[PDB]
Scaffold this active site. Structure first.
Site, PDB file in Angstrom:
ATOM      1  N   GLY A 261       5.004  -4.797   2.434  1.00  0.00           N
ATOM      2  CA  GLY A 261       6.111  -3.854   2.401  1.00  0.00           C
ATOM      3  C   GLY A 261       7.376  -4.422   3.025  1.00  0.00           C
TER       4      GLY A 261
ATOM      5  CG  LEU B 210      21.206   9.341  -6.376  1.00  0.00           C
ATOM      6  CD1 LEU B 210      21.165  10.324  -5.207  1.00  0.00           C
ATOM      7  CD2 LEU B 210      19.857   8.651  -6.533  1.00  0.00           C
TER       8      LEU B 210
ATOM      9  CD  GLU C  67      30.246  13.515  -9.306  1.00  0.00           C
ATOM     10  OE1 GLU C  67      30.368  13.209 -10.509  1.00  0.00           O
ATOM     11  OE2 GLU C  67      30.344  14.683  -8.875  1.00  0.00           O
TER      12      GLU C  67
ATOM     13  CD  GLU D 238      -5.593  -4.782  -0.414  1.00  0.00           C
ATOM     14  OE1 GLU D 238      -5.277  -3.700   0.133  1.00  0.00           O
ATOM     15  OE2 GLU D 238      -6.664  -4.929  -1.032  1.00  0.00           O
TER      16      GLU D 238
ATOM     17  CD  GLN E 202      -2.766   1.465   2.209  1.00  0.00           C
ATOM     18  OE1 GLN E 202      -3.698   0.679   2.196  1.00  0.00           O
ATOM     19  NE2 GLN E 202      -2.675   2.432   3.082  1.00  0.00           N
TER      20      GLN E 202
ATOM     21  CB  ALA F 265       1.514  -9.796   3.903  1.00  0.00           C
TER      22      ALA F 265
ATOM     23  CG  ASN G  64       4.540   7.394   7.580  1.00  0.00           C
ATOM     24  OD1 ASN G  64       4.839   8.021   6.567  1.00  0.00           O
ATOM     25  ND2 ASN G  64       3.800   6.307   7.539  1.00  0.00           N
TER      26      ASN G  64
ATOM     27  CD  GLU H 148       3.004  -0.519  11.107  1.00  0.00           C
ATOM     28  OE1 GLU H 148       1.762  -0.290  11.042  1.00  0.00           O
ATOM     29  OE2 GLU H 148       3.848   0.256  10.627  1.00  0.00           O
TER      30      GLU H 148
HETATM   31  N1  LIG Z   1       3.599   7.712   4.072  1.00  0.00           N
HETATM   32  C1  LIG Z   1       2.732   6.749   3.872  1.00  0.00           C
HETATM   33  N2  LIG Z   1       2.689   5.668   4.720  1.00  0.00           N
HETATM   34  C2  LIG Z   1       1.771   4.692   4.474  1.00  0.00           C
HETATM   35  C3  LIG Z   1       0.888   4.763   3.415  1.00  0.00           C
HETATM   36  N3  LIG Z   1       0.091   3.642   3.441  1.00  0.00           N
HETATM   37  C4  LIG Z   1       0.466   2.871   4.477  1.00  0.00           C
HETATM   38  N4  LIG Z   1       1.485   3.530   5.139  1.00  0.00           N
HETATM   39  C5  LIG Z   1       2.234   3.054   6.297  1.00  0.00           C
HETATM   40  O1  LIG Z   1       2.737   1.760   5.978  1.00  0.00           O
HETATM   41  C6  LIG Z   1       2.617   0.887   7.099  1.00  0.00           C
HETATM   42  C7  LIG Z   1       1.597  -0.218   6.804  1.00  0.00           C
HETATM   43  O2  LIG Z   1       2.022  -0.976   5.696  1.00  0.00           O
HETATM   44  P1  LIG Z   1       1.261  -1.006   4.286  1.00  0.00           P
HETATM   45  O3  LIG Z   1       2.096  -0.499   3.130  1.00  0.00           O
HETATM   46  O4  LIG Z   1      -0.102  -0.368   4.361  1.00  0.00           O
HETATM   47  O5  LIG Z   1       0.916  -2.564   4.233  1.00  0.00           O
HETATM   48  P2  LIG Z   1       1.275  -3.562   3.056  1.00  0.00           P
HETATM   49  O6  LIG Z   1       2.670  -3.337   2.550  1.00  0.00           O
HETATM   50  O7  LIG Z   1       0.271  -3.334   1.974  1.00  0.00           O
HETATM   51  O8  LIG Z   1       1.222  -5.008   3.729  1.00  0.00           O
HETATM   52  P3  LIG Z   1      -0.064  -5.950   3.998  1.00  0.00           P
HETATM   53  O9  LIG Z   1      -1.328  -5.147   3.961  1.00  0.00           O
HETATM   54  O10 LIG Z   1       0.160  -6.557   5.361  1.00  0.00           O
HETATM   55  O11 LIG Z   1      -0.057  -7.035   2.950  1.00  0.00           O
HETATM   56  C8  LIG Z   1       2.146   1.753   8.257  1.00  0.00           C
HETATM   57  O12 LIG Z   1       3.277   2.211   8.977  1.00  0.00           O
HETATM   58  C9  LIG Z   1       1.389   2.866   7.544  1.00  0.00           C
HETATM   59  O13 LIG Z   1       1.312   4.058   8.279  1.00  0.00           O
HETATM   60  C10 LIG Z   1       0.933   5.860   2.559  1.00  0.00           C
HETATM   61  O14 LIG Z   1       0.166   5.954   1.580  1.00  0.00           O
HETATM   62  N5  LIG Z   1       1.868   6.841   2.792  1.00  0.00           N
HETATM   63 MG   LIG Z   2      33.787  14.359 -13.344  1.00  0.00          MG
HETATM   64 MG   LIG Z   3      -1.810  -3.992   2.222  1.00  0.00          MG
END
Ligand SMILES: Nc1nc2c(ncn2[C@@H]2O[C@H](COP(=O)(O)OP(=O)(O)OP(=O)(O)O)[C@@H](O)[C@H]2O)c(=O)[nH]1
Ligand SMILES: [Mg+2]
Ligand SMILES: [Mg+2]
Ligand SMILES: Nc1nc2c(ncn2[C@@H]2O[C@H](COP(=O)(O)OP(=O)(O)O)[C@@H](O)[C@H]2O)c(=O)[nH]1
Ligand SMILES: [Ca+2]
Ligand SMILES: [Ca+2]
Lengths: 440, 422
Positions: free
Chosen positions: A146, A252, A254, A71, A11, A99, A206, A183
């Site tokens: 993630g 970048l 460098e 998903e 996400q 996950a 964040n 987390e």
């Molecule tokens: N900056 C930022 N953080 C995000 C965003 N979406 C989720 N997060 C952060 O990411 C973490 C949650 O992981 P996600 O990326 O939502 O989950 P996922 O990777 O999809 O993993 P699963 O849902 O378990 O399969 C938390 O710390 C959230 O605050 C976003 O759009 N921007």
């Molecule tokens: Mg040079």
């Molecule tokens: Mg997710």
């Protein structure tokens, strides 16, 4: 030549991807249907923007990007939203079941079922490159995908692309917008398993972005949309040298030479300025000196920590917009005559500067004022290890009682993997102490 | 002893090399299309040292342009004189060297070097009697430094009885691209100590100071630095390029300048320093002034083993001889007494563009040790913590090679110190 492939995972990865690619499109004059009227070579080219966009014969400029999530509901929004024509459908890959905030499911149970397909699609992007430079991987620390899917992917990319560069943008968790108690587990597991497979990683705390949005943009309760727009400006600043040309432009890679003194010490601290509302920016022109000054204010860092209580191993300033070296040099001279900038004794103290003349852009309906000049500082400071310390402590609190560990063990993991990851993190914090100690 | 083959490698090497060709082409009356349009025969008498004659009375630089990425040579080719170069003498890769001597010397550069040598061989093959080679490059990056010294080694192997001469730009934190410059420069210096006969030490430290302190340039650009370099390069090659008695070819220059084979690193100087009338006395004083030196060494901190002075323009040779004698007679302590008459002077009637008269200084001074000591200190500050080494070990090098390069450069320093005291 010099192509860069972006991979957005889960996400956070995907939603940050949306924000970055929308921004790139605006920066380069690419319409949401992929057309770019200013580009006179149809169906290909070796322009700087081609590092990030390929072109079809019909004139479409297509991001060299794969979006992956376990998903479908987040990527489904890309499939159906404003930039849906930008991407070929095969670039957007989804499973049916996520996950569940569990690294083990992302790395193993669920992740294993889609990994070959993902690599197949990345391979399709690679084959269209004449001189691939490497990958940029976007992902959260905290999510199951993630964390665990990213680790699996990075491991497989080392195998399949050898030492080709892999850089990360890694979203570090904050309680204000976190969605899982575990987390800290996911963060330590993925940091441990990815560490040898990544050349350079930009952590984005964040909570730092949240505070900046609350304090500098006067946003009462920031959403991901607010956070992501600001993150994208920072990501854009770091990648601008790859996407634009210019006499004063510095690649970048460098900056990376200076940023990474030892393979494990590869986590730069990014600091960005100016972040200011349209209301505050009106009739208020922030000078080169003012924005440079702002880089040394800890409130403007993308990771919460105190560089004034650590030591520098490198300092890089990436300027964009209306900026010339004379003004930069003067700004830097002042800052040295007035700041807690202490270097380790084994590193030169000179600041490394690059300037891209293309001014910063903003997305319509956004929070940031459009400004004439901006800067991103990338520093290698021992202070960044504070972020590891905070995370490692939360991990310890829970792991001591083995809280939630059965969720991972049930998916096939062993306690041994937890202790092994945590020990790697202990050694990393120790690495950051050692590099700051004076030479004998 | 006639033809010289010129090679320019990497970003710095190609940028200063291009400026050198622009400058001397103007001096010799060759326009950007290789056509001659001068008004003096002095211009063409020794033109064959640097140029081939093609069909149509066209003159073509005997010059090979090398890089591991295309960017700078795309720029050279777009440059004002870019069309004068022989198209097949542009040899470049796509990978870049990432400011990494190991990549330039052992991996990326290895893959390209043979094709450079094919071009060099084709150049040498048409030479009636090749004298040798001149290389332009920097020591702080990857291509000029690592691939440039790889080339020098391969060229020596193939032409071991020809002279190797370099214009080698030394890095400085004051004008620095990356922190690893001291590593690349130390690795390169060991190569130079063994495999060149004559090296002009061009110090980016000196160039910056001159631009800042003397030329009143608040914010010097590489372009400003290169103005000084191209002016110097023209000066030091005058004797190779125009009729004359002294140091008229590379071997005779080496024999006059190099009393011990390793000590062949020269401090160049130039006057007047430029970004309307100078007297011989003023030229002479300014050419010997530390402030006019392109290697940031204090010549009063050492001794002159040998010196070559070249004066350009219409001026009194009587006065020139008088002033040169006056310098030696009034500062005799700074000239080693065990090499009698160790200062040689040439005069050439044609002045450089934009000046009535000028002077160029080439010194073999024991003070050059200060420049190597400076690099050595910077190298060690990092190497003691093995900092940044992974960039090199990743290309297959080991630390021992760093220890050895360091030891040999410290030996070089000790060797200068030896003759400073003799
Ligand atoms: N900056 C930022 N953080 C995000 C965003 N979406 C989720 N997060 C952060 O990411 C973490 C949650 O992981 P996600 O990326 O939502 O989950 P996922 O990777 O999809 O993993 P699963 O849902 O378990 O399969 C938390 O710390 C959230 O605050 C976003 O759009 N921007
Ligand atoms: Mg040079
Ligand atoms: Mg997710
Ligand atoms: N004087 C001068 N120095 C340069 C120039 N370009 C780069 N340098 C210096 O050369 C070193 C960097 O090496 P460079 O030639 O750019 O890398 P390469 O292409 O791998 O050989 C640094 O010491 C720079 O300060 C130039 O045009 N003029
Ligand atoms: Ca095109
Ligand atoms: Ca290759």
């Amino acid at each position: 030549m010099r192509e860069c492939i972006s991979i957005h995972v889960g996400q956070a990865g995907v939603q940050i991807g949306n924000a970055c690619w929308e921004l790139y499109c605006l920066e380069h004059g690419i319409q949401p249907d992929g057309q770019m009227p200013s580009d006179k070579t149809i169906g290909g080219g070796d322009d700087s923007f081609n590092t990030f966009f390929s072109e079809t014969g019909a004139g479409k400029h297509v991001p060299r990007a794969v979006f992956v999530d376990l998903e479908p509901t987040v990527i489904d929004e890309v499939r159906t939203g404003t930039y849906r024509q930008l991407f070929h459908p095969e670039q957007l890959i989804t499973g049916k079941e996520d996950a569940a905030n569990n690294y083990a499911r992302g790395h193993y149970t669920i992740g294993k079922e889609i990994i070959d397909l993902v690599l197949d699609r990345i391979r399709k992007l690679a084959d269209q490159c004449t001189g691939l430079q490497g990958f940029l991987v976007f992902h959260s620390f905290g999510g199951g995908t993630g964390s665990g899917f990213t680790s699996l992917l990075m491991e497989r990319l080392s195998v399949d692309y050898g030492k080709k560069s892999k850089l990360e943008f890694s979203i570090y968790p904050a309680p204000q917008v976190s969605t899982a108690v575990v987390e800290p587990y996911n963060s330590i597991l993925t940091t441990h398993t990815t560490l040898e497979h990544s050349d350079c990683a930009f952590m984005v705390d964040n909570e730092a972005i949240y505070d900046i949005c609350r304090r500098n943009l006067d946003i009462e309760r920031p959403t991901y949309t607010n956070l992501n727009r600001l993150i994208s400006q920072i990501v854009s600043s770091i990648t601008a040298s790859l996407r634009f040309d210019g006499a004063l432009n510095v690649d970048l890679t460098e900056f990376q030479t200076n940023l990474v003194p030892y393979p494990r010490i590869h986590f730069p601290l990014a600091t960005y300025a100016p972040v200011i509302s349209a209301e505050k920016a009106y009739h208020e022109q922030l000078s080169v000196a003012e924005i440079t000054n702002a880089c040394f204010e800890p409130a403007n860092q993308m990771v919460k920590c105190d560089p004034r209580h650590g030591k520098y191993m490198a300092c890089c300033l990436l300027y964009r917009g209306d900026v010339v070296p004379k003004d930069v040099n003067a700004a830097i001279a002042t800052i040295k005559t007035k700041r807690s900038i202490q270097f380790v004794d084994w590193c030169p103290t000179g600041f490394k500067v690059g300037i891209n003349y293309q001014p910063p852009t903003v997305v319509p309906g956004g929070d940031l004022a459009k400004v004439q000049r901006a800067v991103c500082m990338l520093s290698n400071t021992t202070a960044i290890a504070e972020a590891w310390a905070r995370l490692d402590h939360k991990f310890d609190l829970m792991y001591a009682k083995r809280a939630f560990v059965h969720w991972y063990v049930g998916e096939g993991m062993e306690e041994g993997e937890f202790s092994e990851a945590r020990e790697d993190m202990a050694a990393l914090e120790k690495d950051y102490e050692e590099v700051g100690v004076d030479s004998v | 002893m006639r033809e010289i083959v010129h090679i320019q490698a990497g970003q710095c090497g190609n940028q200063i090399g291009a400026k050198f060709w622009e400058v001397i082409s103007d001096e010799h009356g060759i326009d950007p299309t290789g056509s001659y349009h001068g008004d003096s025969d002095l211009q063409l008498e020794r033109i064959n040292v640097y140029y081939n004659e093609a069909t149509g009375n066209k003159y073509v630089p005997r010059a090979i342009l090398v890089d591991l990425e295309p960017g700078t040579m795309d720029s050279v080719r777009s440059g004002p004189f870019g069309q004068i170069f022989r198209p097949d003498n542009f040899v470049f890769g796509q990978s870049g060297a990432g400011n990494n001597w190991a990549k330039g010397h052992y991996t990326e550069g290895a893959e390209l070097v043979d094709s450079v040598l094919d071009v060099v061989r084709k150049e040498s093959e048409s030479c009636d009697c090749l004298q040798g080679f001149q290389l332009t490059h920097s020591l702080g990056g990857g291509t000029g430094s690592g691939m440039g010294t790889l080339l020098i080694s391969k060229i020596r192997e193939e032409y071991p009885d020809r002279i190797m001469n370099t214009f080698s730009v030394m890095p400085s934190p004051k004008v620095s691209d990356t922190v690893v410059e001291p590593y690349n420069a130390t690795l390169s210096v060991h190569q130079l100590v063994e495999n060149t006969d004559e090296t002009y030490c061009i110090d980016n430290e000196a160039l910056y100071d001159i631009c800042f302190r003397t030329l009143k340039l608040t914010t010097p650009t590489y372009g400003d630095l290169n103005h000084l370099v191209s002016a110097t390069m023209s000066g030091v090659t005058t004797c190779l390029r125009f009729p004359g008695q002294l140091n008229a070819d590379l071997r005779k220059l080496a024999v006059n300048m190099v009393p011990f084979p390793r000590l062949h690193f020269f401090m160049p100087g130039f006057a007047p320093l430029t970004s309307r009338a100078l007297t011989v006395p003023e030229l002479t004083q300014q050419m010997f002034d530390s402030k006019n030196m392109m290697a940031a060494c204090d010549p009063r901190h050492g001794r002159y083993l040998t010196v070559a002075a070249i004066f350009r323009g219409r001026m009194s040779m009587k006065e020139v001889d008088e002033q040169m004698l006056n310098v030696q007679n009034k500062n005799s302590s700074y000239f080693v007494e065990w090499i009698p008459n160790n200062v040689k002077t040439a005069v050439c009637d044609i002045p450089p563009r934009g000046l009535k008269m000028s002077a160029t200084f080439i010194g073999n001074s024991t003070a050059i040790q200060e420049l190597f000591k400076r690099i050595s200190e910077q190298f060690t500050a990092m190497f003691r913590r093995k900092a940044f080494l992974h960039w090199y070990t990743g290309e297959g090098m080991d630390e021992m090679e760093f220890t050895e390069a360091e030891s040999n450069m410290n030996d070089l320093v000790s060797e200068y110190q030896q003759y400073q005291d003799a």
